[PDB]
Amino acid sequence: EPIRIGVLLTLSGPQGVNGEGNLRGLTLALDQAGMQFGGRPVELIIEDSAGQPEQAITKTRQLIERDRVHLIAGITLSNEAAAVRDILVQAEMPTIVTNAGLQALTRDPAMRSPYLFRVSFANGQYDAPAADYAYETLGYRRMVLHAADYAAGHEEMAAFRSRFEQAGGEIVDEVVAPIGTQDFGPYLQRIEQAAAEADAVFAFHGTSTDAIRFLVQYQEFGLKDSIPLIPSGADVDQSILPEIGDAALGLVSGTLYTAYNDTPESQEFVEAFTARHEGILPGLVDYAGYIGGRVIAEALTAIDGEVENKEALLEALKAVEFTGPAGNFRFHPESQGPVTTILLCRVEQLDDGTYANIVVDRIPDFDDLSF
Ligand SMILES: [Cl-]
Ligand SMILES: [Cl-]
Ligand SMILES: [Cl-]
Ligand SMILES: [Cl-]
Ligand SMILES: [Cl-]
Ligand SMILES: [Cl-]
Ligand SMILES: [Cl-]
Ligand SMILES: [Cl-]
Ligand SMILES: [Zn+2]
Ligand SMILES: [Zn+2]
Ligand SMILES: [Zn+2]
Ligand SMILES: [Zn+2]
Ligand SMILES: [Zn+2]
Ligand SMILES: [Zn+2]
Ligand SMILES: [Zn+2]
Ligand SMILES: [Zn+2]
Ligand SMILES: [Zn+2]
Ligand SMILES: [Zn+2]
Ligand SMILES: [Zn+2]
Ligand SMILES: [Zn+2]
Ligand SMILES: [Zn+2]
């Protein structure tokens, strides 16, 4: 009778804030759907991976072997994804990835699988349209790239470069800074110098204290006044927008979602989210969890809960389509990553003092293969 769904997330340690966001979005979607399908109650079995590959393995083995779940959602870190991929595939377990943006998982034909779906992004996917915007609308021809020095950072630089290069632009330098950098001074100076022969900078750190320290120092050091900057959408996420504030004002970025999107489905998700979370606005990770849950809900509805029929479950997941809070969402038929609407936004200040990502332009049907 019950429909058992495993959720593997990083819910403690410094990455726990991301898993928590995913879990809020996911449960909100399953609750709007009533937590039952075809007369069958859902039960979520939640396991914390603590951001650790070996614990991700243990947890994943347990949900499959002990808990006998019919589906797994989540996976916070790319290193956790890489460590459990083979287990999920060998077990023929339908899996909905809500965060881990590891490019290979959908883009490399050897890592992909019909059991793996991704509803968040491949790294770089929501930033790459900002490179089109930089070339086509802003007139930039030569850019400097900067990122925190880890895998997602490299992949975001590469995705940005690829689109900027395809439009006819050129990348003059890449500047990388270690994770947990306190003084961005030296990296800022290097960026300044590269930008003598450049029109603008793109920077990614993820939604992190790195991002806060970088943006704030970018302005304080004087570069905001002189060198246009396109932050990653992660770097101006809602959760940290109040602490940047003034440093990101007027900056344009690509993003997956903002609570200020002026569509009815976005307004409905903000209302249901804020009613549940004491006025707090949903951000990126909440959004991505929500799409996870809606996908599951739409697939389960279509097969009337007959979740043990894996063939029908997979065919139903492949066919899922709806208007979500960012726009229309579906899966690429070959990568099973997202084909979705990317929002180009600018940070603005509202009349009450609040900082907001405001939508200036939309790129529909942007897939994870086009960069
Ligand atoms: Cl082009
Ligand atoms: Cl062109
Ligand atoms: Cl919250
Ligand atoms: Cl909460
Ligand atoms: Cl569509
Ligand atoms: Cl569309
Ligand atoms: Cl395509
Ligand atoms: Cl394509
Ligand atoms: Zn139970
Ligand atoms: Zn447990
Ligand atoms: Zn392998
Ligand atoms: Zn590196
Ligand atoms: Zn063009
Ligand atoms: Zn210094
Ligand atoms: Zn200088
Ligand atoms: Zn609706
Ligand atoms: Zn809350
Ligand atoms: Zn094809
Ligand atoms: Zn347009
Ligand atoms: Zn479309
Ligand atoms: Zn395409």
Tag the structure with descriptive keywords.
371 residues; Rossmann fold; 5-stranded antiparallel sheet; 15 strands; 37% helix; binds chloride ion; binds zinc ion; metal-binding
| Rough outline | globular
* First and last CA, distance: 44 Å
Tell me the Rg in angstroms.
20 Å
CATH homologous superfamily name of the largest domain? Answer: Response regulator
Task: Give helix % range.
Answer: 25-40%
Largest sheet: 6 strands, mixed
Q: Could you tell me the strand content as a percent range?
A: 15-25%
Query: Could you say what the CATH architecture of the largest domain is?
Result: 3-Layer(aba) Sandwich
- Regarding CATH, which class of the largest domain? Alpha Beta
Q: Which structural class do you get from the secondary structure elements?
A: alpha/beta
Chemical compounds bound to the protein: chloride ion, zinc ion
Provide the succession of SSEs: EHEEHEHEHEHEHEHEHEHEHHHEEEE
Strand order of the largest sheet: 2-3-1-4-5-6
SS field, number of helical segments: 12
